[PDB]
């Protein structure tokens, strides 16, 4: 469980990225991509992309991160009663996209360092470390749900 303080933290960053959806969703999702390559394997929209400049030149993957950023900032700030905005998300991450919950791992590694990247002095340690709980306990809540379908 966060603190109220944790929250904060975590949403104080949050509203910066709020800023720019799109830009933080690219250099995420290429982040994720470069880093591990096997989650870009999961895409079938993304997976003809073999190069960072042709990732940064896709209409359709900037599209997709805000799509991606859009449903976490929503679950962010439910502040930790985000039961209903996980139901969906698990179960199509678990039962239709296939997505393993390490790989949420690597995009909660990817979400940190764009975060760090891009707003140092709202991101230092404490707020790192304050995300860093906030995205495991989007990792254990759905996790939680992967286990109930039996993945
Ligand atoms: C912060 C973590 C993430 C969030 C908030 C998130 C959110 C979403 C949302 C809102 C959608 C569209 C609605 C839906 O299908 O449920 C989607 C689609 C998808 N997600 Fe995620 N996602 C996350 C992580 C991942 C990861 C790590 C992978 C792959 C490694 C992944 C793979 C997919 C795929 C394959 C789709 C369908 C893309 C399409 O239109 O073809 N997601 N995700
Ligand atoms: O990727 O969602």
Same mark, same amino acid.
């Given at each position: 469980?966060? $603190?109220?303080?944790?929250? +904060?933290?975590?949403?104080?960053?949050?509203?910066?990225?709020?800023?720019?959806?799109?830009?933080? #969703? +690219?250099?995420?999702?290429?982040?994720?991509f470069? $880093?591990?390559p096997?989650?870009?394997?999961?895409?079938?929209?993304?997976?003809?992309?073999?190069?960072?400049?042709?990732?940064?030149? $896709?209409?359709?993957?900037k599209?997709?991160?805000?799509?991606?950023?859009?449903?976490?900032?929503?679950?962010?700030?439910?502040?930790?009663?985000?039961?209903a905005?996980?139901?969906?998300?698990? +179960?199509?991450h678990?039962?239709?996209?296939?997505?393993?919950?390490?790989?949420?791992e690597?995009?909660?590694?990817?979400?940190?360092?764009?975060?760090? $990247?891009?707003?140092? #002095?709202?991101?230092?340690?404490?707020?790192? #470390?304050?995300?860093?709980?906030?995205?495991?306990?989007?990792?254990?809540?759905?996790?939680?749900?992967?286990?109930?379908?039996?993945?």
């Amino acid at each position: 469980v966060l $603190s109220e303080g944790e929250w +904060q933290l975590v949403l104080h960053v949050w509203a910066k990225v709020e800023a720019d959806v799109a830009g933080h #969703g +690219q250099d995420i999702l290429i982040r994720l991509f470069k $880093s591990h390559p096997e989650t870009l394997e999961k895409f079938d929209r993304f997976k003809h992309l073999k190069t960072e400049a042709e990732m940064k030149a $896709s209409e359709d993957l900037k599209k997709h991160g805000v799509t991606v950023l859009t449903a976490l900032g929503a679950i962010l700030k439910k502040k930790g009663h985000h039961e209903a905005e996980l139901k969906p998300l698990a +179960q199509s991450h678990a039962t239709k996209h296939k997505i393993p919950i390490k790989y949420l791992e690597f995009i909660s590694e990817a979400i940190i360092h764009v975060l760090h $990247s891009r707003h140092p #002095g709202d991101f230092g340690a404490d707020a790192q #470390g304050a995300m860093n709980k906030a995205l495991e306990l989007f990792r254990k809540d759905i996790a939680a749900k992967y286990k109930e379908l039996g993945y």
